């Protein structure tokens, strides 16, 4: 079945919560769509690289390692999932 418009599952309250963790007291109504934009770009970049690691391995399943390697490449090393 066709996947569409899923960036809207990244809800307003969920964006509010992350801003809180980041110390933000007041949030303009325009922030929610800017954030979605940015998240999407962030995910496109990491996922593009993870998927390339998957294809290179001749696999159909994206692993924690493809993601960990993908993040490493973008200078965003992650601890907790192998490597």
């Amino acid at each position: 079945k066709v996947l569409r418009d899923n960036i809207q599952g990244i809800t307003k309250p969920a964006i509010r919560r992350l801003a809180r963790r980041g110390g933000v007291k007041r949030i303009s109504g325009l922030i929610y769509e800017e954030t979605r934009g940015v998240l999407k770009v962030f995910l496109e970049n990491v996922i593009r690289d993870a998927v390339t690691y998957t294809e290179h391995a001749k696999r159909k399943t994206v692993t924690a390692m493809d993601v960990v390697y993908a993040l490493k490449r973008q200078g965003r090393t992650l601890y907790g999932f192998g490597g």
Partner: protein, 105 residues
């Protein structure tokens, strides 16, 4: 004394570090002391983090180290924070910190 760790006075595994340097194409040849030196450095740094995370566990009335303790440890320490400046500790959260201007007045 049989093991190279035992010889070097070390907990971290000198044989393993030797093998990983050889099978990682860092150079054709690996000198005798390099894995010794390197296992020592690795042991030291883990001791420094465990120490600091250990303290954080105790400050939060806790007995067992979790990722939040490692994260508190790392980012409260000027030097570990720099070394892991570009690193994300899964499940670590962030430091409690609220800028002044946002406090009620």
């Amino acid at each position: 004394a049989k093991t190279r760790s035992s010889r070097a006075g070390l907990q971290f595994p000198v044989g393993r570090v030797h093998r990983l340097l050889r099978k990682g194409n860092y150079a054709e040849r690996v000198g005798a002391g390099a894995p010794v030196y390197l296992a020592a450095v690795l042991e030291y740094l883990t001791a420094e983090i465990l120490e600091l995370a250990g303290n954080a566990a105790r400050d939060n009335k806790k007995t067992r180290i979790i990722p939040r303790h490692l994260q508190l440890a790392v980012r409260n320490d000027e030097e570990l924070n720099k070394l892991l400046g570009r690193v994300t500790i899964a499940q670590g959260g962030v430091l409690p910190n609220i800028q002044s201007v946002l406090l009620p007045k």
